Design an enzyme around this catalytic site. Structure first.
Site, PDB file in Angstrom:
ATOM      1  N   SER A 173      25.273  43.192  13.154  1.00  0.00           N
ATOM      2  CA  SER A 173      25.041  44.531  12.571  1.00  0.00           C
ATOM      3  C   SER A 173      24.874  45.669  13.566  1.00  0.00           C
ATOM      4  O   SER A 173      24.906  46.828  13.159  1.00  0.00           O
ATOM      5  CB  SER A 173      23.819  44.632  11.597  1.00  0.00           C
ATOM      6  OG  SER A 173      23.605  43.505  10.715  1.00  0.00           O
ATOM      7  N   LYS A 181      18.903  50.118  15.792  1.00  0.00           N
ATOM      8  CA  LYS A 181      19.715  49.369  14.836  1.00  0.00           C
ATOM      9  C   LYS A 181      19.612  47.899  15.220  1.00  0.00           C
ATOM     10  O   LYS A 181      19.948  47.512  16.344  1.00  0.00           O
ATOM     11  CB  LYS A 181      21.188  49.781  14.873  1.00  0.00           C
ATOM     12  CG  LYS A 181      22.028  49.022  13.848  1.00  0.00           C
ATOM     13  CD  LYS A 181      21.681  49.453  12.420  1.00  0.00           C
ATOM     14  CE  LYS A 181      22.216  48.487  11.367  1.00  0.00           C
ATOM     15  NZ  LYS A 181      21.441  47.204  11.314  1.00  0.00           N
ATOM     16  N   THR A 182      19.150  47.086  14.278  1.00  0.00           N
ATOM     17  CA  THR A 182      18.979  45.660  14.503  1.00  0.00           C
ATOM     18  C   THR A 182      20.197  44.842  14.094  1.00  0.00           C
ATOM     19  O   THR A 182      21.159  45.361  13.521  1.00  0.00           O
ATOM     20  CB  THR A 182      17.781  45.121  13.704  1.00  0.00           C
ATOM     21  OG1 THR A 182      17.898  45.558  12.346  1.00  0.00           O
ATOM     22  CG2 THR A 182      16.464  45.624  14.283  1.00  0.00           C
ATOM     23  N   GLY A 183      20.128  43.551  14.398  1.00  0.00           N
ATOM     24  CA  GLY A 183      21.189  42.625  14.055  1.00  0.00           C
ATOM     25  C   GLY A 183      20.577  41.245  13.889  1.00  0.00           C
ATOM     26  O   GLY A 183      19.663  40.878  14.627  1.00  0.00           O
ATOM     27  N   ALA A 184      21.072  40.489  12.916  1.00  0.00           N
ATOM     28  CA  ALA A 184      20.584  39.140  12.649  1.00  0.00           C
ATOM     29  C   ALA A 184      21.751  38.362  12.055  1.00  0.00           C
ATOM     30  O   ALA A 184      22.206  38.663  10.950  1.00  0.00           O
ATOM     31  CB  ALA A 184      19.418  39.184  11.664  1.00  0.00           C
ATOM     32  N   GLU A 211      32.910  42.788   7.186  1.00  0.00           N
ATOM     33  CA  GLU A 211      31.739  42.033   6.741  1.00  0.00           C
ATOM     34  C   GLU A 211      32.196  41.012   5.704  1.00  0.00           C
ATOM     35  O   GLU A 211      33.045  41.315   4.865  1.00  0.00           O
ATOM     36  CB  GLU A 211      30.700  42.969   6.124  1.00  0.00           C
ATOM     37  CG  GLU A 211      30.100  43.994   7.081  1.00  0.00           C
ATOM     38  CD  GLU A 211      29.154  43.384   8.100  1.00  0.00           C
ATOM     39  OE1 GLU A 211      28.811  42.187   7.967  1.00  0.00           O
ATOM     40  OE2 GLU A 211      28.740  44.110   9.033  1.00  0.00           O
ATOM     41  N   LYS A 230      27.414  48.508  13.591  1.00  0.00           N
ATOM     42  CA  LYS A 230      27.413  49.574  12.601  1.00  0.00           C
ATOM     43  C   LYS A 230      27.146  50.949  13.215  1.00  0.00           C
ATOM     44  O   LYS A 230      27.506  51.970  12.634  1.00  0.00           O
ATOM     45  CB  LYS A 230      26.392  49.256  11.506  1.00  0.00           C
ATOM     46  CG  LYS A 230      26.816  48.062  10.654  1.00  0.00           C
ATOM     47  CD  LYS A 230      25.702  47.537   9.767  1.00  0.00           C
ATOM     48  CE  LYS A 230      26.187  46.316   8.989  1.00  0.00           C
ATOM     49  NZ  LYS A 230      25.071  45.554   8.385  1.00  0.00           N
ATOM     50  N   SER A 290      21.036  48.158   6.783  1.00  0.00           N
ATOM     51  CA  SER A 290      22.069  47.245   7.254  1.00  0.00           C
ATOM     52  C   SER A 290      22.897  46.692   6.096  1.00  0.00           C
ATOM     53  O   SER A 290      23.244  45.513   6.071  1.00  0.00           O
ATOM     54  CB  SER A 290      21.435  46.098   8.048  1.00  0.00           C
ATOM     55  OG  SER A 290      22.359  45.559   8.980  1.00  0.00           O
TER      56      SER A 290
END
Length: 262
Positions: free
Chosen positions: A44, A208-211, A140, A47, A104
């Site tokens: 993510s 901005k995070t990501g997982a 996605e 983005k 997200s």
């Protein structure tokens, strides 16, 4: 400084995974790097570059952010926190960008990609601002496979840090657009346990995070330590097992290590 390196090295060893860190201190342009030139799945965090590409268009296409796109049950993916509330209705590109960045939302991301003509156009935007490392290859949710050794949808901590700096503090985006991106990042609702968790509570942050798969846990941010020059930080982390659990705590620890005393 080498104590910082030793601490990051120990953090990675104890985590059992691979850690990538890139910190840029805009006060003197100094940097703290750890596997900074290695490629990591962005997930993510991709983005941000995507939303930025849309913002870039608004610089020459008046009112594009108010343009509407239709949301249908068929567009829904595996993560639609905001879009599922608009099934059968419309969302403006601004709302889609906000949903993409602050919650997200995957369906929102795909709508932005469709608008832009595909992932390839985001890669193109990255190249236009001088980022020759970044690459977006899929939509996605496929872009989150984060398979070890796969270069699809990856970038390096340093390349993403430099691009984040250019976009939020540099001249990659015009004034209004730059301000909007900064506002969206500051309003993110998913970073509470990541980079932000390793910083003094009153510092201002945009991130901005990501997982994703392989326990890949990411976060990229711009940090304003009180009234001092902002810091740009990228903390990427991935593990050996495809079904590994996420480690936001590792990102928080990495953040504390490189920002303490800044």
């Amino acid at each position: 400084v080498q104590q910082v390196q030793k601490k990051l090295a120990a953090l990675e060893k104890q985590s059992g995974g691979r850690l990538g860190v890139a910190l840029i201190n805009t006060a003197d342009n100094s940097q703290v790097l750890y596997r900074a030139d290695e490629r990591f799945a962005m997930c993510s965090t991709s983005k941000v570059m995507t939303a930025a590409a849309v913002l870039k268009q608004s610089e020459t296409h008046d009112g594009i952010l108010q343009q509407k796109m239709t949301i249908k049950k068929a567009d829904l993916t595996n993560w639609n926190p905001v879009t599922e509330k608009y099934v059968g209705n419309t969302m403006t590109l601004a709302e889609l960008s906000a949903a993409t960045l602050q919650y997200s939302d995957n369906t929102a991301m795909n709508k932005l990609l469709a608008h832009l003509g595909g992932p390839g156009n985001v890669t193109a935007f990255a190249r236009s601002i001088g980022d020759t490392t970044f690459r977006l290859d899929r939509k996605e949710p496929e872009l989150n496979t984060a398979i070890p050794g796969d270069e699809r949808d990856t970038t390096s901590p340093l390349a993403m840090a430099k691009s984040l700096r250019k976009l939020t503090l540099g001249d990659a985006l015009a004034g209004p657009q730059r301000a909007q991106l900064v506002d969206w990042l500051k309003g993110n609702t998913t970073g509470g346990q990541s980079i932000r968790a390793g910083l003094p509570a009153h510092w201002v942050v945009g991130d901005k995070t990501g997982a994703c798969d392989y326990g890949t846990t990411n976060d990229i941010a711009v940090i304003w330590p009180e009234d001092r020059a902002p810091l740009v930080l990228v903390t990427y982390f991935t593990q050996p097992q495809q079904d590994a659990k996420w480690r936001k705590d590792v990102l928080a620890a990495a953040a504390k290590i490189v920002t303490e005393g800044k």
